[PDB]
């Protein structure tokens, strides 16, 4: 037994008693803030939140007296790793206050930075209203190129200096926690150590991501070539039919999701998509029936009822009056059998689907309620939002909709509607996987020093032409920080959790449709009325983090690593259809074409032949004098030939 083990076990027993009653108070005070926005309620959760944040730092230093080399129990050892990790407490005193100032500066530049119109400089647009609605709605080439560039440049410069400092620091925090760099710190969520054949290194994730990406690359090239052909009809004389796509024409500000190109790229535009938003009005479905239809969806597969206090304590419907609340759809795990759902539910199709999505998190949280407190989470960072998306995937099928009451029973779906559905999925699912892969591959190489600080923006657009297939419309030097203009980069968030969530989502779906004895294609599958499929899901749901995630995958899919063949079986009716539409077109892209390339003038300077000795060095100050000499030459030509006064600068 060894005293050590006993001591640890006890310490954890007295810990979980005093953690559960104290975390319940910090969560209920935050629930009362978000349903009831009062400035009384702001510091109601801030003194209760700091009672929690200080309680962890007391109990972290008490857990250092139990080293890990002698603990034989794995449940006890797993809670000690979550509690002994130092975090940002390992830094200096003035460096830990310097790091929190940089993080608060970058998140304030992102949310409060604005962009002003050039011809009317009194109207300035923030990002989240106004500048996002330009890139999502406009079809004008010059208005999309303006927003992009502008926002880019500004936020760029800002996040630049701060970003550099931050990168420099976060590495010291990771190396003092016995990691190689900060990229190795982020991959520690997937690390499994010594569970007798279920192990997983932190460097095996880079190999498993690059191996599974090379099988998406045939499907992505046919989707990239089909979008390029349909974009040439909306922007003629702007997109080369063998080159990359311009970065500002991709549906939003960064090109993360291609879902706003559906109105330009729809394969059969005359056939409308399956929408049940009007039959829910004609059957008078309020924001209690669709949660009762969602609850009976889960009891059909064998998952239990709701917890009988879920209906009383909830926020299923908006107040509407002066009583204010925040409407982001979240599931809550307050503690001691308290599970609450907060969303202002409309009567629409997607709020019927988001009700199935958010109740997937509640059925996940209701399963591992018997676990210890530190093991009440997903098996890694991808499992949580993957279970919540296979619930909305099955609930949006027309086989499920026609048996719930909507979608009148003499309704045969067309095989042109299924291609209209599969392309709207592939613009969001497949269209984000080369963006998610390239961004984490750029950040992993910056953190470990494989990319020097004078080649950050050279390697960013070299990787976008090669991996993503997206070209910049304006050349960006090392004064910009275009990756930091995304929310997850400047607010310190791990981005690999969106790649692995996409791969687990279809691995879970294919493993559940075989249990439910599904016959047709994968994208028409339902898991409802199948108890033997809910049994395969609940055996992973009840684990939490008590078992490794490689063992949690084998409880569902029968494998130990993440696989990409279930993703390609989902988009198999689309992939055969895309190979027929790209018979004449060119599949692939060349990384040499550029939107500014046919108007460029190449300058070649040979300094040591005109001077030899007494020849000056060509630094960045000489490039400033060249740009002012060309700007002088353009000013004289427009005055002496065209009689116009155009003030060209060196920034033009």
């Amino acid at each position, epitope marked *: 037994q*060894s005293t050590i083990e*006993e001591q640890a076990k*006890t310490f954890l*027993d007295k810990f979980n008693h005093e953690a559960e009653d104290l975390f319940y108070q910090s969560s209920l005070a935050s629930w009362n803030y978000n349903t009831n926005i009062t400035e009384e309620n702001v510091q109601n959760m801030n003194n209760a939140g700091d009672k929690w944040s200080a309680f962890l730092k007391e109990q972290s230093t008490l857990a250092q007296m139990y080293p890990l080399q002698e603990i034989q129990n794995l449940t006890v050892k797993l809670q000690l790793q979550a509690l002994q990790q130092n975090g940002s407490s390992v830094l200096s005193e003035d460096k830990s206050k310097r790091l929190n100032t940089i993080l608060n500066t970058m998140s304030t530049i992102y949310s409060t930075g604005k962009v002003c119109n050039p011809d009317n400089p009194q109207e300035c647009l923030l990002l989240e209203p106004g500048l996002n609605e330009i890139m999502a709605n406009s079809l004008d080439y010059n208005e999309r190129l303006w927003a992009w560039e502008s926002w880019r440049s500004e936020v760029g410069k800002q996040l630049r200096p701060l970003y550099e400092e931050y990168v420099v620091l976060k590495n010291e925090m990771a190396r003092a926690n016995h990691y190689e760099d900060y990229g190795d710190y982020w991959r520690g969520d997937y690390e499994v150590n010594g569970v007798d054949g279920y192990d997983y290194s932190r460097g095996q994730l880079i190999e498993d991501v690059e191996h599974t990406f090379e099988e998406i690359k045939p499907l992505y090239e046919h989707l990239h070539a089909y979008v390029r052909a349909k974009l040439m009809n909306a922007y003629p004389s702007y997109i080369s039919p063998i080159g990359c796509l311009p970065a500002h024409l991709l549906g939003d500000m960064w090109g993360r999701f291609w879902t706003n190109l559906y109105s330009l790229t729809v394969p059969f535009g005359q056939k409308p998509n399956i929408d049940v938003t009007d039959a829910m009005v004609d059957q008078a479905w309020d924001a209690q029936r669709i949660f009762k239809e969602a609850e009976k969806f889960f009891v059909s597969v064998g998952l239990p009822n709701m917890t009988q206090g879920f209906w009383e304590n909830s926020m299923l419907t908006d107040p509407g009056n002066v009583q204010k609340a925040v409407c982001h759809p979240t599931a809550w795990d307050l503690g001691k059998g308290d599970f609450r759902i907060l969303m202002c539910t409309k009567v629409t199709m997607d709020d019927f689907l988001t009700a199935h999505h958010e109740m997937g998190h509640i059925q996940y949280d209701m399963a591992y309620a018997a676990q210890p407190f530190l093991l009440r989470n997903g098996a890694n960072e991808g499992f949580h939002e993957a279970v919540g998306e296979i619930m909305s995937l099955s609930a949006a099928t027309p086989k499920h909709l026609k048996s719930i009451g909507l979608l009148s029973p003499d309704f045969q779906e067309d095989n042109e509607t299924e291609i209209n559905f599969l392309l709207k999925q592939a613009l969001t699912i497949v269209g984000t996987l080369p963006f998610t892969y390239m961004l984490e591959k750029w950040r992993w190489m910056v953190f470990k020093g494989e990319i020097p600080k004078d080649q950050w923006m050279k390697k960013w657009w070299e990787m976008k032409r090669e991996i993503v297939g997206v070209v910049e419309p304006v050349p960006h030097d090392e004064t910009y920080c275009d990756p930091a203009s995304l929310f997850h980069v400047s607010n310190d968030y791990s981005f690999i959790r969106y790649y692995t969530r996409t791969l687990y989502q279809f691995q879970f779906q294919e493993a559940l449709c075989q249990a439910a004895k599904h016959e047709g294609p994968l994208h028409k599958c339902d898991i409802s009325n199948s108890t033997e499929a809910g049994q395969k899901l609940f055996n992973m749901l009840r684990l939490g983090k008590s078992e490794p995630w490689t063992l949690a995958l084998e409880n569902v899919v029968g494998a130990k690593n993440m696989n990409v063949r279930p993703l390609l079986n989902y988009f198999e009716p689309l992939f055969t259809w895309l190979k027929d539409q790209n018979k004449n077109s060119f599949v692939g892209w060349s990384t040499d074409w550029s939107p500014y390339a046919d108007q460029s003038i190449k300058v070649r300077i040979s300094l040591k032949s005109a001077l030899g000795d007494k020849a000056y060095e060509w630094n960045d100050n000489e490039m400033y004098l060249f740009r002012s000499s060309v700007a002088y030459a353009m000013r004289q030509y427009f005055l002496k030939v065209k009689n116009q006064m155009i003030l060209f600068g060196e920034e033009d």
Partner: antibody, heavy 121, light 108 residues
Framework: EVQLEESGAELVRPGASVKISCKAFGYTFTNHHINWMKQRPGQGLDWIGY????????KYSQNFKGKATLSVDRSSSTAYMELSSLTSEDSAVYYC??????????????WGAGTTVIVSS | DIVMTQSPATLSVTPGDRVSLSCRASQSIRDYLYWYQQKSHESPRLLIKYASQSISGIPSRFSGSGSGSDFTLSINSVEPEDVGVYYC?????????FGGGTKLEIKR
């Protein structure tokens, strides 16, 4: 100051059950495990087990499982040791001792004075 | 479980003498023994925290040494009132089996 209090030099008829009480003083209480040891006269010590006052959790050595039970009253700061099926062999000085901390340092600090338990009719 | 043995069994050393008392281990007890001084008709006290660290309130000359499986309680120029049965406790295994015992007599 920190003391532990014992109770009774109990003479019991063999075959019956006994009640050994250890009263606390000074330190809090529900913040230090309470152990028990047996010492035969003219012999070395050996271990009975312990009762955690928090969580009422007990642990025993293998020679005493099913022989003695351990209880505790949080409202009165008394710990109980109760042996049952008393033979002629369980005739020794019984010490109640705590160790400090709760999970940190697992070595004894302060002791009782021993309750002499004699088994004879 | 672990059998804790004491290398002497009885000493009768005169005062003013530097002595050494050894508890040998059984398996691998990594610096987790504790030395106990028990006088006659009393409750034992503490002598050594883990292997050489001392409890405040003890007089001087009480020092432990060694680790792993060999330990030595060292008394230097003993007192006339340093009599009693000097035990050694265990760490690792839960059933902390108390050592044998080493009585301390005097006279020459």
């Amino acid at each position: 100051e920190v003391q532990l209090e014992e109770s009774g030099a109990e003479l019991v008829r063999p075959g019956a059950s006994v009640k050994i009480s250890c009263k606390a003083f000074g330190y809090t209480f529900t913040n230090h495990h309470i152990n028990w040891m047996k010492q035969r006269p003219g012999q070395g010590l050996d271990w009975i087990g312990y009762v955690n006052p928090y969580n009422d959790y007990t642990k025993y050595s293998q020679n005493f499982k099913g022989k003695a039970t351990l209880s505790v009253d949080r409202s009165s700061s008394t710990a109980y040791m109760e042996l049952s099926s008393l033979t002629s062999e369980d005739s020794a000085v019984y010490y109640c001792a705590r160790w400090r901390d709760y999970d940190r340092d697992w070595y004894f600090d302060v002791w009782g004075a021993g309750t002499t338990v004699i088994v004879s009719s | 479980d672990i059998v804790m043995t004491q290398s002497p069994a009885t000493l009768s050393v005169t005062p003013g003498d530097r002595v050494s008392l050894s508890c040998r281990a059984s398996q691998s007890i990594r610096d987790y023994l504790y030395w106990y001084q028990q006088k006659s008709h009393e409750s034992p006290r503490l002598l050594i925290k883990y292997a050489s660290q001392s409890i405040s309130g003890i007089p001087s000359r009480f020092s432990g040494s060694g680790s792993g499986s060999d330990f030595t309680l060292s008394i230097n120029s003993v007192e006339p009132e340093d009599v009693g049965v000097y035990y050694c406790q265990n760490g690792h295994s839960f059933p902390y089996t108390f050592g044998g015992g080493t009585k301390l007599e005097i006279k020459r």
